Amino acid sequence: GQSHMLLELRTAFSQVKTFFQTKDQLDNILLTDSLMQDFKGYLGCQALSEMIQFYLVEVMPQAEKHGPEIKEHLNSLGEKLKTLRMRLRRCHRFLPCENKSKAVEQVKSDFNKLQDQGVYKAMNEFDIFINYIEAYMMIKMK
Amino acid sequence: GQSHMLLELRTAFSQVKTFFQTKDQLDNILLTDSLMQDFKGYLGCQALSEMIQFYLVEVMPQAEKHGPEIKEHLNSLGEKLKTLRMRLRRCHRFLPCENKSKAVEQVKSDFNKLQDQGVYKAMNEFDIFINYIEAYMMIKM
């Protein structure tokens, strides 16, 4: 609802709005209600996560360079959006899909340290993996 | 009734297991209960996704490189794992997290088709984006 972060994002954006609005010449809307539809549905988390990423990694760093006079405002918007994202991440109702598994990262790092042996081990343990996939499926049906 | 697709994967794997088993000299275990724990919690879709990816992208290509003499058997195993992935992705309680928003794909596609106008339009509509975030949050409650 009336979130501080949203108000922070809106306030910061209002400092650069005119600059982009005056340059936005085409009649079509980019962000359509179909986007809003996907946010509503069962892949809402993925949709929103991807849109946040798109603004943070594509739109804003490109916008930054379409003018230095707004660079500091776009950095600040970027920080605030990143902060929003990290916050949504930590609420299971919002962006739980962005959280990565530490057990997987531990697997990757052990594998890396083992080198050729990690290849032989990971493959040898592929039966373990299949068993876990099966368990995952079982647990998802309760 | 997916235990036939698992049966397949297990059968494909059983024929190459020993090639790696005899070369796996170290004592410890890579895939441990902590992983299965993660598969069982709120981030389980993500953990399973990343594991299937890890095997497809990191482990199996190296196994192919190390075991060219069974490379066909490994390709077979990889395609069965890929097939399984795709099936899980179609079932909303399995790998829903690998599905992409079509609406987002269209946004990215329009954005690229617009070039510099895309940057201007996307930034101009950042207010809309903030509204969409706000609706999303409300909806999720």
Side-chain angles (χ1 to χ4, degrees):
Chain A
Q2 305 178 288
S3 155
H4 205 229
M5 278 311 299
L6 299 181
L7 186 71
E8 289 284 332
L9 277 167
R10 290 183 169 106
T11 296
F13 176 58
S14 73
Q15 300 286 114
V16 302
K17 172 62 171 181
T18 297
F19 183 89
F20 294 102
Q21 187 175 34
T22 57
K23 306 180 168 50
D24 180 14
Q25 309 271 80
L26 307 174
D27 190 346
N28 60 318
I29 293 301
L30 188 64
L31 304 190
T32 54
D33 67 304
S34 40
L35 181 62
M36 192 53 232
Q37 258 314 91
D38 282 3
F39 284 8
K40 286 167 67 220
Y42 85 86
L43 53 75
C45 188
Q46 288 74 29
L48 172 63
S49 164
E50 186 167 3
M51 286 302 308
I52 290 174
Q53 185 76 356
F54 167 68
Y55 274 98
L56 290 172
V57 196
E58 303 177 55
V59 177
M60 292 177 172
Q62 297 181 215
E64 253 209 280
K65 283 278 165 127
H66 276 88
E69 60 260 47
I70 45 74
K71 174 226 167 46
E72 283 313 313
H73 300 264
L74 277 170
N75 295 142
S76 159
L77 264 188
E79 293 164 349
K80 295 159 193 276
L81 179 57
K82 164 93 158 220
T83 294
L84 180 56
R85 177 190 217 169
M86 297 299 116
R87 292 170 57 76
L88 295 177
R89 222 180 246 188
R90 281 280 165 242
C91 168
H92 64 94
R93 220 156 310 151
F94 294 145
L95 270 201
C97 60
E98 293 205 341
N99 302 298
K100 68 191 189 201
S101 156
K102 318 161 103 179
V104 175
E105 314 317 307
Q106 188 56 47
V107 171
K108 287 188 58 168
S109 153
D110 287 350
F111 168 91
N112 188 54
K113 292 174 200 169
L114 293 174
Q115 308 279 26
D116 55 316
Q117 285 285 320
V119 171
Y120 311 133
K121 186 173 291 309
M123 289 303 295
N124 188 27
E125 296 183 18
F126 192 87
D127 45 18
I128 293 167
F129 180 39
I130 294 172
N131 295 336
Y132 294 176
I133 298 170
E134 191 165 5
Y136 173 86
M137 292 173 350
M138 286 186 72
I139 204 67
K140 279 290 184 294
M141 309 276 289
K142 66 187 183 157
Chain B
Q2 278 79 313
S3 50
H4 83 287
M5 175 57 72
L6 295 171
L7 151 71
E8 228 155 88
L9 192 64
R10 283 187 171 105
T11 289
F13 175 61
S14 66
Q15 278 146 92
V16 293
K17 182 179 168 75
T18 313
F19 181 95
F20 301 98
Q21 182 182 8
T22 60
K23 305 181 179 55
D24 176 12
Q25 310 294 4
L26 294 177
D27 299 302
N28 220 331
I29 301 286
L30 187 64
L31 306 191
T32 68
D33 192 62
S34 195
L35 187 61
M36 189 55 225
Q37 287 177 29
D38 275 4
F39 281 15
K40 279 174 181 170
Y42 82 96
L43 60 66
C45 191
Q46 285 89 287
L48 176 54
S49 192
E50 296 165 273
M51 280 310 300
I52 288 167
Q53 188 76 0
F54 168 69
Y55 267 95
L56 285 178
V57 155
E58 201 56 49
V59 178
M60 291 186 224
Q62 301 196 234
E64 291 162 357
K65 157 196 199 137
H66 286 72
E69 59 271 47
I70 51 166
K71 189 170 174 199
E72 74 291 323
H73 279 106
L74 288 157
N75 185 270
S76 169
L77 178 73
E79 290 299 322
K80 293 186 170 62
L81 179 60
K82 290 183 224 174
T83 292
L84 172 62
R85 193 183 207 167
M86 290 296 293
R87 297 187 181 196
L88 297 181
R89 184 184 305 177
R90 318 223 167 287
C91 283
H92 67 95
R93 57 189 41 241
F94 292 148
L95 278 192
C97 61
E98 287 189 350
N99 298 309
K100 272 204 313 162
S101 164
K102 288 176 178 191
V104 176
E105 181 172 342
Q106 180 161 301
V107 165
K108 286 182 161 187
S109 169
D110 292 355
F111 166 87
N112 279 295
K113 290 188 268 183
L114 297 168
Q115 305 169 24
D116 301 68
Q117 280 293 303
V119 182
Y120 302 142
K121 179 170 299 299
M123 275 310 308
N124 186 36
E125 302 189 13
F126 191 79
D127 43 23
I128 295 172
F129 178 43
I130 293 171
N131 289 347
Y132 287 3
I133 297 169
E134 185 173 36
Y136 172 85
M137 279 169 91
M138 291 172 173
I139 281 156
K140 299 288 152 150
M141 293 183 284

